[PDB]
Structure 1
C-alpha cells in the first residue's frame, strides 16, 4: 500500500511537469525568441539611459 501510493504520487507529478514543458515549447518558438531579444535590448537600453 505504501509503495503503490508513492508510485501514484510520482506519476501525477511527472504528468503535470510534462504538460508545463510542452506549453513552454509551444510558447517560445525561435522567431518569437528573436523578437523577445529585440524587446529586451530596447528595454535595457531605456532602463540604462533613465
Structure 2
C-alpha cells in the first residue's frame, strides 16, 4: 500500500510538469522572442534615462531645502499672491467682452 501510493503521487506530478512545458513552447515562438527582445531594449533604455533624470532633480532640490522653513513660508506667500493677481486679471478680461 505504501509503494502504490508513492507511485501514484509521482505520476501525477510528472503529468502536471509536462503540460506546463508544452504551454511554454506554444507561447514563445522565435518571432515573438525577437519582439520581446525589442520591447526590452526600449524599456531598459527608458528605465536608464529616467533613473538619470531623477537623480539630477533630486540633487537641485536639496540646495533650496537647505534655506530653512522661514523661506518656504515666504515662497508659499509669494505663490499665493501670484495666484490671486492671476485670478483678478483673468476676471477683468472676461467683463470687457460683455459690453453689448
TM-score range, shorter chain: over 0.9
Consecutive unaligned residues of structure 1, counting only runs of 5 or more, are none
Q: How many residues align?
A: 49
- CA RMSD between the two structures: 0.4
1:5-38 alpha-carbon deviations (Å, 9 max, x no partner): 0110000000000000000000000000000000
CA distance in 1, matches of 2:15, 2:41: 36
Consecutive unaligned residues of structure 2, counting only runs of 5 or more, are 50-100
Over 4 Å off, 4+ runs = none
CA distance in 2, matches of 1:44, 1:4: 52
Could you tell me how far 1:45 is from its partner in structure 2?
0.2
TM-score for the superposition, normalised by structure 1: 0.96
